[PDB]
């Protein structure tokens with residue numbers, strides 16, 4: 001059971017390089033618009049507390065250099081939507097996929113296409129943490145890289161990368177420029193809140209363990225949502241809702257293990273540990289697989 | 299994070315190959331489709347297939363090749379070790395710059411898992427020392443390929459053929475020669491005992507020092523032989539002088555001598571992590587190569 005990213009070719013064909021003055025990052029080129037983080041119009045001097053409304057009025061089309069591989073794109077218009085810059089360009093991308101912009105919830109997963117200088121570098125699978133950060137791998141120049149899901153040739157863009165927090169986790173917006181989490185696009189002191197484990201994803205991962213070989217952690221017992229939720233808080237675990245139980249229903253129906261019975265397994269694992277046994281070859285409990293992820297893979 | 303390569307250059311080469319009732323994936327490069335030769339097997343042939351006798355009875359029109367909605371015309375065919383090479387009517391217009399390479403255990407690569415010719419997911423892999431892949435491959439995944447990409451040239455190194463009973467996977471290079479002692483035949487065969495890729499753990503430890511963690515270092519050193527005598531008690535691969543030379547650059551960039559990093563690994567194996575993590579893991583990661591670390 002591997003963590004898998006979506007195939008990235010539909011997105012690779014949209015990545016471009018955006019340069020404003022001395023600042024270069026990545027942009028997303030869909031039809032005749034290029035989307036990128038608005039802090040590209042910041043001068044490094046003004047990363048501390050910029051006024052984006054003012055800095056953009058003073059910009060003109062000629063302040064933006066957009067490069068698609070070998071080819072320079074001519075910017076013919078610019079505007080802002082929340083924290084993303086929208087650069088209208090000369091040419092529609094002939095590789096534009098069927099796509100939509102969506103906003104995801106903490107605990108959902110997506111693929112990230114990490115890019116540098118407009119050129120795709122690698123792909124990995126991520127989860128939006130309960131504290132609204134991403135445990136990604138982003139280096140200098142990675143801003144504007146996007147995250148996405150694919151459903152039957154339709155790309156759902158859900159994330160654009162903006163910044164790294166002092167604990168090495170990452171923060172970004174949806175493609176309409178709304179931040180995930182209580183962060184702002186400026187170099188001021190900010191930090192991730194204390195993170196928590198995504199309970200519904202651990203359970204889904206335990207179902208995947210049962211779907212494969214592993215069954216030793218099953219027991220005769222069952223809990224209640226209220227009794228399990230007291231256990232969850234003690235171990236820094238997101239509380240489990242009736243909504244989570246309902247979505248795990250398919251896996252509970254397929255494997256014959258009710259969710260509150262799996263919770264009994266999980267509560268038991270959280271207290272007594274694994275006693276030298278493993279689950280899908282892992283010694284810790286994995287929480288970056290959603291229920292849909294497990295159904296899809298299996 | 300362990301990252302796969304962007305998969306688009308390979309997605310444009312995946313096709314569907316059908317022969318009778320068997321369908322799997324093929325790789326379409328220029329005017330040749332490559333795929334596993336057991337596409338020409340039926341039910342009653344998996345146990346003891348005679349591939350020469352099965353192939354002699356086929357003609358070009360027995361092979362149905364589909365690239366998306368378009369049927370390709372097969373105009374020739376031949377067998378090279380355990381891969382079939384289907385000469386087609388049309389050169390793939392999306393053929394990337396590519397080459398074929400055979401890799402060694404410990405090497406990493408990306409896998410594009412496909413079903414019925416359409417890409418489903420991409421993940422990053424290592425060739426294990428027992429010549430198997432710890433992959434994620436379902437019923438129709440055969441013919442999925444593994445690859446690296448360097449300066450826009452795609453190095454194809456793996457094509458998927460079989461699942462072993464332990465859940466791991468075996469396959470061939472793109473010339474059809476199996477990695478390890480496996481055969482494309484449904485008989486009792488089993489992966490040998492697997493071991494940890496020691497040179498990859500050490501390279502990763504060097505990556506931890508470079509990103510500013512040093513908690514696992516100690517003041518000891520070790521001889522190469524003493525290191526290997528301890529490490530093999532944990533099912534770690536022996537470290538060779540070639541591996542030592544290979545880590546040299548990282549040892550220079552960090553100032554930590556290779557054998558001093560070996561002493562730290564012996565201690566990590568002795569103690570565990572005591573609830574800590576090194577890069578982002580509570581496990582010793584062995585699927586990032588020395589070459590990977592510098593990049």
Ligand SMILES: CC(C)(C)[C@H](NC(=O)C(F)(F)F)C(=O)N1C[C@H]2[C@@H]([C@H]1C(=O)N[C@H](C=N)C[C@@H]1CCNC1=O)C2(C)C
Pocket residue numbers: 025039042047138139140141142143144162163164165166170184185186187188189190191
């Ligand atoms: C880490 C740093 C101290 C530099 C800063 N962090 C914080 O200001 C915080 F602590 F508030 F998060 C930060 O990321 N930025 C400062 C400045 C932009 C952003 C930035 O340079 N983004 C990079 C875009 N290519 C990607 C970064 C590069 C390192 N790894 C990444 O992912 C803006 C928030 C406007």
Ligand SMILES: CC(C)(C)[C@H](NC(=O)C(F)(F)F)C(=O)N1C[C@H]2[C@@H]([C@H]1C(=O)N[C@H](C=N)C[C@@H]1CCNC1=O)C2(C)C
Pocket residue numbers: 322336339344435436437438439440441459460461462463467481482483484485486487
């Ligand atoms: C797992 C099974 C017991 C069926 C068998 N294994 C062994 O015979 C062994 F144990 F000896 F390896 C096995 O894999 N095959 C039997 C037959 C082909 C191959 C096969 O069906 N390949 C699939 C290609 N689409 C991919 C497989 C599907 C399951 N998961 C995969 O990855 C050949 C070896 C000629």
